[PDB]
């Protein structure tokens, strides 16, 4: 009664909506539903995401999708979705990491929206997934020029101070960050704090009608830059030295903040969050070099509205695409290589799926029932937690092959 074999999950065009009825109670009253992935860059996880987007959109009226990219990165993706009059390939509207993480789903979404006539809001809930603050600072400088020109030299100094942060991924940008002198780093961090406090102090004036929503956009840009610099500082310790336990919660708390603000600002929004299992999880995550981090989902599970749900995706394959770091010569500082996935053990969610659904097709299970499962695959490893508290449901596909458009 709490599990279901789904034969159509990997076939979004031939979906049998009866197979997802098990989710209808948990999705009622939800305004935020996360669709996970146990590993990035997996073809089957993009397929399952497209199917569950169909279910949430067509049967529960979800109307927005949030991605692990920045707000400006996402506006370009929105241009892609809405375009048609010319050569409008996704490569023209996306950066390399965004393309590999979401390209397959994004190409499908555009067709789906055109053919179905439906409409969805795209939202970047993240920092720039490059950790390059250039776009944010450039938009801030244009806004500030209009609404608070007195502080425009300060924004332009910041732009110059941070011009060398131009990577296409966190590992590249963080390496460029570590090449700056400590005093220039702290001067930039202090510069952003000065700007943040000035803008908040002037809010009653800058919210005047002639400025439209420019105060809000400036405030969002500054927040994005502030957390980008702190995440660059952390990413540096997270390999090159003294990473403090819990520090990797900072980026995920930014994401939780963007989602929370967006939902309470727009009360009709019902958003589907496309993020990793480790980000959607509602309990503390222990993984790789982090003894314990607080995930985005644990913040969102705090909402008094109790309207967040998290669906983890896992798989029964013997291998999984993994990120290989370091990877000298690779354009983004890492590569994606097929590697053996973590062994399935008796107290694993994977074994429960095998015991419940079998191994023939995919499986969908709720987590609120006594069970032996305490660990679940994540990348080529596993995380251990209380899975009834950590996720609301689990989606498990038969295999996890590298997505064919991923070029890393």
Numbering used by the authors: 11 to 418
Give excerpts from the publication.
We determined the three-dimensional structure of EreC H289N in two different crystal forms. However, there is a notable difference in a loop between residues 295 and 303. Not unexpectantly, electron density corresponding to erythromycin could not be explicitly identified in either of the two structures. To examine the binding of erythromycin to EreC, flexible docking (Dock v6.9) was used to build a model of the EreCClosed-erythromycin complex. The rationale behind utilizing the closed conformation of EreC for the docking experiment was because of the higher resolution structure, providing greater confidence in the position of the amino acid conformers. However, it was found that the closed conformation of the loop was actually compatible with macrolide binding, and it suggests that the closing of the loop can be important for catalysis. Upon examining the docked structure, we were able to see that erythromycin sits snugly in the active site of EreCClosed with the interfacial surface area of 633 Å2, as calculated by PDBePISA. Upon the binding of erythromycin, the flexible loop of EreC closes over the active site, positioning the ester bond within the vicinity of residues H50, E78, and H289.
One of these resistance mechanisms entails the enzymatic cleavage of the macrolides’ macrolactone ring by erythromycin esterases (Eres). Both crystal forms show that the protein can be divided into two parts, a major and a minor lobe. The major lobe makes up the greater portion of the protein and is composed of 8 β-strands (β1–6, β9, and β12) forming a continuous sheet, surrounded by α-helices and loops.
